[PDB]
Write an enzyme that holds these catalytic residues in place. Structure first.
Site, PDB file in Angstrom:
ATOM      1  N   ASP A  25     -42.112  11.411  19.682  1.00 22.88           N
ATOM      2  CA  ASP A  25     -42.152  10.133  20.385  1.00 22.88           C
ATOM      3  C   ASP A  25     -40.757   9.522  20.458  1.00 22.88           C
ATOM      4  OD1 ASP A  25     -42.744   7.846  21.584  1.00 22.88           O
ATOM      5  OD2 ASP A  25     -43.911   6.981  19.993  1.00 22.88           O
ATOM      6  N   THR A  26     -40.070   9.770  21.567  1.00 20.31           N
ATOM      7  CA  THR A  26     -38.723   9.243  21.761  1.00 20.31           C
ATOM      8  C   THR A  26     -38.726   7.717  21.754  1.00 20.31           C
ATOM      9  OG1 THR A  26     -38.184  11.168  23.106  1.00 20.31           O
ATOM     10  CG2 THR A  26     -36.704   9.267  23.236  1.00 20.31           C
ATOM     11  N   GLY A  27     -39.887   7.128  22.013  1.00 18.83           N
ATOM     12  CA  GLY A  27     -40.009   5.675  22.031  1.00 18.83           C
ATOM     13  C   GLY A  27     -39.952   5.095  20.620  1.00 18.83           C
TER      14      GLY A  27
END
Length: 95
Positions: A25-27
């Site tokens: 999850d780059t977020g």
């Protein structure tokens, strides 16, 4: 079957020789791991801000193995369903 892509097999991580499943999850700026027990010292952590107010625990001296690569850093632990990886580790691998 173009509608759906088979995509290469998922990805797994090894912590202390244990096999675990996690999603990228780059977020997520940080990394959180579902509640679990681990050897070594631990510390109590609390989260608030907006839409938060739960007590969690974290480890500041653990090593994580990714793609046969060693890495040492802080690994926050919470009651989240499973394990989620944030930019902290994603960037740790480098380019």
């Amino acid at each position: 079957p173009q509608i759906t892509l088979w995509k290469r097999p998922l990805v797994t991580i090894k912590i202390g020789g244990q096999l675990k499943e996690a999603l990228l999850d780059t977020g997520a700026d940080d990394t959180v791991i579902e509640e679990m027990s681990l050897p070594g010292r631990w510390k109590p952590k609390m989260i608030g801000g907006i839409g938060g107010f739960i007590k969690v625990r974290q480890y500041d001296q653990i090593i994580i193995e990714i793609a046969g690569h060693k890495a040492i850093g802080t690994v926050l632990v919470g009651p989240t369903p499973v394990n989620i990886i944030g930019r902290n580790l994603l960037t740790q691998i480098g380019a």
